[PDB]
């Protein structure tokens, strides 16, 4: 028996589907793990990875960050407020990146996406800092059906969790892109619901959120810094059995709780 997970047991089954969590403390090693070596549909919560990737290819491209990028209307998607505000004047990569992380922009992260070769460019740059269970197949807003039992545009708690250390926190991006991706990721606007409402307000929290809504779909992940102490990493994935589930922001802020007081 795992008595660590009879509290995460309980709050699947109350919110009527699966949760995923794996939570990671730098400082010690210590971990806690609910399911999470199963497969969960990212969402949106791809356009951190995706901002990741850009970063990763402006180390070698001068100035790439910096280029400005005049789309068209034929590039706007649903929920693309920035990317419709800034229409009539155009936006760089870092602008654009920006957009897709913090307001999960869907025109910017569609164009940074083929900027990368697309959903497959992204799966070669995750496969490159070593996550071999990340997979991005379509683009937006096609990759949000969450079909129960398809692997299209999945990955699990635990890789989602050891790729973003080794981006914020590790030696995957050289340092100053690497504090870029920080700052963008504590600068989201989308997730005050989710992970930011399980952790101490005097506490640095940068985080990407994930909604496909079908199927009681829904995510956070985030690298959390106690005051003064090592930071933790973590991630929180749902899904349930049903099209029209609901997904529900206080059970991966309930999650995220139970995954901090288990952490040593
Ligand atoms: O960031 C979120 O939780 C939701 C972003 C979003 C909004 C509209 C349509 C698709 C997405 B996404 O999850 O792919």
Not at 25 to 28: C, E, K, V
Not at 212 to 216: I, L, S, T, W
């Given at each position: 028996t795992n008595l660590v997970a009879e509290p995460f047991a309980k709050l699947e089954q109350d919110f009527g589907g699966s949760i995923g969590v794996y939570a990671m403390?730098?400082?010690?090693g210590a971990t806690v793990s609910y399911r999470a070596e199963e497969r969960f549909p990212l969402c949106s919560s791809f356009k951190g990875f995706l901002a990741a990737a850009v970063l990763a290819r402006s180390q070698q491209q001068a100035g790439l960050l910096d280029t400005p990028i005049r789309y068209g209307k034929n590039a706007l998607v649903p929920w693309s407020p920035i990317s419709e505000k800034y229409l009539t004047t155009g936006m760089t990569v870092a602008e654009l990146s920006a957009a897709a992380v913090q307001y999960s922009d869907n025109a910017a992260a569609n164009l940074l996406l083929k900027e990368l070769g697309g959903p497959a460019g992204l799966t070669a740059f995750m496969r490159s800092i070593g996550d071999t269970t990340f997979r991005l197949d379509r683009w937006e807003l096609e990759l949000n059906s969450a079909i129960p039992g398809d692997a299209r545009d999945t990955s699990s708690p635990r890789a989602v969790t050891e790729s973003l250390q080794k981006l914020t926190l590790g030696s995957a991006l050289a340092a100053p892109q690497r504090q870029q991706f920080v700052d963008w990721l504590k600068g989201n606007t989308t997730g005050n619901h989710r992970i930011r409402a399980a952790v101490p307000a005097d506490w640095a929290v940068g985080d990407k959120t994930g909604t496909?809504?079908?199927?009681?779909t829904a995510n956070d992940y985030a690298v959390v810094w106690p005051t003064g102490r090592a930071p933790i990493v973590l991630a929180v994935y749902t899904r349930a059995p049903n099209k029209d589930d609901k997904h529900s922001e206080a059970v991966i802020a309930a999650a995220a709780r139970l995954a901090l007081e288990g952490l040593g």
């Open positions: 403390d730098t400082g010690s496909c809504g079908v199927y009681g």
